[PDB]
Ligand SMILES: Cc1ccc(F)c(C(=O)/C=C(\O)C(=O)O)c1F
């Protein structure tokens with residue numbers, strides 16, 4: 065049609081031209097050698113990719129049947145466990161080992177702090193995320209509900225000094241807690257100077273230095289009256305800006321203008337669950353943003369340069385101004401018609417992402433001044449893997465890609481998502497398969513919950529999705545992930561990460577609650593916005609993660625029996641009003657997410673739930689909601705009438721929340737006419753038949769359908 069023939073492949077022209085004209089120049093890779101390597105890698109690895117996917121289906125069919133042929137009303141755990149062992153689901157645990165991954169940047173091996181995830185197809189969000197390495201604490205407190213809007217402190221169209229003063233007081237308390245003075249409080253400071261290479265703070269009746277002078281990291285401006293003071297605590301930097309001429313500074317007792325926090329230490333630029341990309345045109349938009357990030361010239365607003373500081377001794381030094389970037393590739397499941405073979409078969413999308421995002425990442429190892437990785441690594445998050453054979457396959461794919469690209473072996477590092485049950489229960493073997501490439505493990509708990517529901521779909525009805533947060537299986541899974549990482553030597557070598565905070569407006573609650581993750585020994589956890597990164601950074605100043613990890617060493621805190629505890633609901637635990645709240649809430653969140661996915665190609669959206677809580681949705685939260693309703697429909701908790709009635713009831717409410725808001729197409733009243741409504745319906749009624757309950761097959765088909773009707 066409009067394709068380019070290379071060997072057995074037929075490449076969409078928009079992708080061929082993008083690679084030749086934009087991605088390849090400056091890499092010293094010969095274009096014809098590249099495309100021949102694409103041909104050879106696709107041919108060589110596609111059989112094993114398909115075999116792994118078939119093995120998923122075969123395992124799930126055996127588990128399905130096993131549950132259907134059970135009569136003994138409470139599950140016999142020892143029988144279930146030996147069955148899983150016989151069919152090859154539960155594999156032997158290897159002997160203890162230590163990972164050997166080398167060439168990794170300090171932001172990953174050593175620094176504990178927030179990790180931000182943003183959709184790579186939104187250039188403005190990607191830029192703000194890269195720039196979120198540093199963020200204003202004052203803006204983050206003033207603009208959110210961390211400072212309550214009680215009487216007097218309300219936000220309005222102009223500055224509220226009552227509220228601003230609360231902001232200042234909060235930050236002063238943070239400084240006392242994080243960088244203590246020898247005597248007195250920062251609240252009473254009247255000035256800062258550096259004298260004989262050390263920081264002295266002026267109080268109203270004396271002067272004082274820090275309880276630990278080593279927390280003084282540097283300053284800007286004249287040592288006489290500095291323009292800022294740079295502190296460090298638990299490896300993260302804090303900058304007090306000093307400017308009495310600013311409006312905030314005029315009011316401040318020491319002329320302080322702002323407190324800047326090192327925030328999003330690393331950032332994951334996402335090609336997976338937060339974007340909608342169903343063809344070559346969509347992929348190229350994402351590849352091109354990733355290219356502009358790595359070259360440094362992406363602009364909508366531009367990327368920040370590094371920050372210059374004067375050392376306490378008087379010399380000069382610099383600090384990175386940008387978040388260290390990972391890229392999340394898609395996993396093993398999907399194909400994309402960006403490339404088809406001679407038969408018209410689509411090429412596996414994960415294989416393509418490895419080739420093209422890896423190629424593009426070479427630019428980030430080279431000058432265009434500052435770069436990405438000063439130590440020479442490329443950082444790829446690989447999601448949705450099931451078990452160690454699937455991890456071994458990713459490592460071989462990366463190896464073959466390094467060869468095509470002329471890169472040293474093990475340049476391409478792997479952030480392993482622990483977000484599928486067969487990976488959880490074989491986690492040690494999964495780490496071992498990537499022992500020379502792994503740079504993190506992370507509990508992707510939302511995907512993990514969807515896999516929990518689908519895997520035991522035949523077992524019975526599951527608890528409500530709000531109950532999953534506290535079920536035995538997920539508490540064991542969180543502790544097990546930390547134990548396995550620490551036992552593999554992750555302390556000082558690789559990140560131990562936990563999952564995403566989705567209530568974008570509930571920042572007071574995040575600051576109160578999310579501290580549990582570093583208290584659990586996690587050296588990183590996921591945030592949805594630059595503002596959330598700045599606030600989550602407070603937690604790493606309160607919690608000494610390095611100390612926590614050392615205290616956790618050698619502990620075995622989860623048993624296989626706990627990991628395998630299926631979240632079945634007990635006998636009729638639900639009144640009719642509770643069942644309908646669950647159905648309505650799930651249909652509302654499904655419809656609000658899917659309508660912007662199908663009609664507008666937006667892969668992450670804030671969707672208010674039934675309690676009017678704004679939730680950041682992507683495919684993982686959709687997987688949970690659709691699988692839970694499919695499970696309730698499968699075991700008779702609800703009827704097919706109940707599902708259809710709820711969809712029809714919530715759809716006009718979703719229509720209203722998107723009313724006017726740009727060229728949006730209402731779903732109501734012509735339900736059977738809306739591709740988006742039909743996609744939402746299909747995700748529920750066909751959910752039990754989707755592979756591992758994944759949502760991409762239906763989403764991609766329905767988005768391509770909508771694009772075709774928008775052209776005829
Ligand atoms: C930006 C955003 C919002 C909501 C999410 F759930 C995710 C996500 O992808 C989480 C996992 O991967 C998982 O828990 O499975 C996200 F990146």
Ligand SMILES: [Mg+2]
Nearest residue numbers: 483508511684
């Ligand atoms: Mg996930």
Ligand SMILES: [Mg+2]
Nearest residue numbers: 298605607608
């Ligand atoms: Mg400390």
